[PDB]
């Protein structure tokens, strides 16, 4: 799905949406393409354990440095563990193999920290994938979800992009924390502000990075 997203972006960017002509960004909005899931919080502890995050539905996940993944559903008990060889496994926090004790402990720690100290991005919105991969640049953290969605959070201004290749849409969250979902094809049609245009150009570069970094 990344290749498909890469093309969707190439197209919108090639149209030079903000360059010229009367920009009618509002007409490109498509509330029907609202994202189901997105990362609302994250903690970068990759120096020791890995990346911890919270999805908008309050489920939490961790992509450990050993490429394994642990997902805790919003009921606070159901767990899904993904080994390196894709081996998906179901369980609970109450009944789990002793071997996962360390990883379940770390997830609880992450969950605690996030729920108590971090803001929920998209908290004013009403919307299970796991974190396939992620990386960070000087200006952003890029999150690639297993459902094909790609999220880009810009550190400085706190703006965020949520790219869904299925919907061929992009949800932009501006500094005022406004939540707007646009259909990429319509952005080509009606254009958009310099701000979103710039971030979509960045998005393409990130998508390309994801494609040449995978394995």
């Amino acid at each position: 799905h990344l290749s498909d997203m890469l093309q969707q972006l190439h197209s919108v960017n090639a149209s030079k949406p903000s360059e010229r002509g009367l920009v009618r960004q509002e007409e490109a909005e498509d509330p029907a393409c609202i994202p189901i899931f997105w990362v609302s919080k994250w903690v970068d502890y990759s120096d020791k354990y890995g990346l911890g995050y919270q999805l908008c539905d309050n489920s939490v996940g961790v992509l450990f440095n050993d490429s394994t993944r642990l997902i805790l559903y919003n009921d606070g008990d159901s767990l899904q563990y993904i080994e390196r060889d894709g081996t998906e496994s179901y369980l609970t926090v109450s009944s789990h193999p002793n071997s996962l004790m360390k990883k379940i402990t770390l997830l609880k720690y992450f969950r605690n920290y996030m729920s108590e100290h971090l803001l929920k991005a998209g908290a004013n919105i009403t919307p299970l994938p796991y974190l396939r991969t992620w990386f960070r640049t000087r200006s952003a953290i890029i999150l690639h979800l297993s459902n094909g969605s790609v999220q880009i959070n810009f550190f400085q201004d706190h703006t965020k992009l949520i790219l869904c290749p299925l919907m061929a849409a992009v949800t932009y969250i501006d500094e005022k924390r406004d939540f707007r979902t646009y259909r990429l094809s319509l952005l080509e049609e009606y254009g958009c502000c310099k701000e979103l245009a710039s971030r979509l150009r960045y998005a393409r570069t990130m998508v390309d990075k994801l494609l040449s970094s995978r394995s």
């Binding site: 994250w42 996030m114 971090l118 959070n153 706190h158």
Partner: peptide, 6 residues
Amino acid sequence: XLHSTM
């Protein structure tokens, strides 16, 4: 940042 927005 080692974490998202507080």
